[PDB]
Design a protein around this nucleic acid. Structure first.
Length: 342
DNA sequence: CGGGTTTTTGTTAAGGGCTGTATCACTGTGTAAGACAGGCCAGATC
């Protein structure tokens, strides 16, 4: 419940809104810088380390059999259990969208030096169109794993896309896609309780269930307080997917999800209205089949956040949240605050 | 197609005055960051 000032090094310009911090055994790694990778680091992945409330970036290299990936500004991060992550969707530095899916991992470790193995994965079947601003989770059902994808924005279709509205975006279909990591195949499932496309939501996972919280809908310009309970099941045949609406929803878009302890997450940040930025936090609780969203203490915000207009960040893993605000320009382009909650 | 006759059109010289054009020496627009080689201390080491 503390708010701390953070001093940043020289390449503060390499941090932009929409980045994605990734954790690997107590070590946080930066990703998604601004612009194409320069010659200071031909890969882009940087080591996230905070020492005495000071920020320093450190480059990193890949293995031989890796695949040099372009930076992405709105990917779909997802943990997995050796230990590895999944990246899907996002916007290339050329403002284009990428349908490819990535699997990062650790190759070697020697004296605080980490090597990665970026491996492109082929997707076959009911492949989704290139999306961004969505989420993806992994469910465990009877010793089997399966990826759940939902939401995301995208441009107009190939036909209706005109150069007078070339940057117009539209919410994708509310379809739910199960992604198999072994075969690299997907399957399109439609649900009756899903009517409005959702984006910038928050996905909380469990053993075999995933939960949906808040978001935004371009079709209506409304931030609904929804709570969906998707229980994916993996029998010996075709999987099963079911939805269920639950009371006690939150109206927030682009929130930050962190884990203080098991079966209890903390939500902070986001937006209530167009200009009414969310300030209060939110405490959840994951029981056997129930959920309980409740209010917690409101951390002491400084005079900068209370009168700002926009913010961004992501999770760090150790109950800490990396938060930044827009600075001046003529000066430092941004400021950055770390938040502690444990 | 010619004289007789007529009305238009130049033509010289020198000077005056208004108009147009070449000539002089110059300018303002080509203006922030990144790649790289060399030196150097902190530190794991056999």
């Amino acid at each position: 419940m503390s708010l701390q000032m953070v001093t940043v090094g020289h390449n503060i310009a390499l941090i932009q809104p929409g980045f994605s911090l990734m954790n690997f055994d107590g070590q946080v790694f930066f990703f998604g810088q601004k612009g194409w990778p320069k010659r200071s680091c031909p890969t882009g992945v940087f080591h996230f380390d905070i020492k005495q409330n000071h920020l320093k970036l450190k480059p990193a290299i890949f293995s031989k059999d890796s695949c040099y990936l372009p930076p992405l500004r709105y990917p779909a991060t997802c943990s997995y259990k050796k230990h590895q992550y999944i990246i899907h969707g996002g916007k290339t530095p050329n403002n284009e969208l990428s349908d490819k899916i990535y699997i990062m991992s650790v190759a070697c470790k020697n004296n605080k030096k980490v090597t990665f193995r970026c491996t492109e994965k082929d997707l076959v079947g009911d492949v989704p169109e290139p999306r961004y601003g969505h989420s993806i989770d992994v469910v465990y059902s009877r010793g089997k794993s399966m990826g759940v994808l939902f939401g995301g924005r995208s441009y107009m279709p190939s036909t209706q896309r005109t150069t007078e509205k070339w940057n117009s975006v539209a919410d994708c279909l509310p379809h739910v896609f199960l992604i198999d990591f072994e075969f690299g195949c997907a399957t399109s499932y439609i649900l009756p309780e899903l009517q409005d496309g959702l984006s910038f939501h928050v996905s909380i996972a469990r053993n075999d269930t995933v939960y949906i919280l808040g978001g935004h809908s371009l079709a209506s310009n409304i931030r609904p307080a929804n709570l969906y309970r998707i229980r994916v099941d993996l029998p010996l045949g075709t999987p099963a997917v079911n939805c269920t609406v639950l009371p006690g929803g939150i109206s927030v878009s682009s929130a930050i999800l962190t884990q203080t302890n098991n079966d209890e997450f903390v939500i902070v940040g986001g937006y209530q209205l167009e200009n009414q930025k969310r300030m209060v936090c939110s405490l959840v609780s994951l029981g056997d089949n129930t959920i309980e969203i409740s209010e917690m203490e409101t951390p002491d915000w400084t005079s900068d956040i209370k009168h700002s207009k926009i913010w961004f960040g992501s999770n760090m893993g150790n109950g800490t949240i990396f938060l930044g605000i827009p600075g001046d320009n003529k000066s430092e382009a941004f400021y950055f605050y770390t938040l502690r909650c444990s």
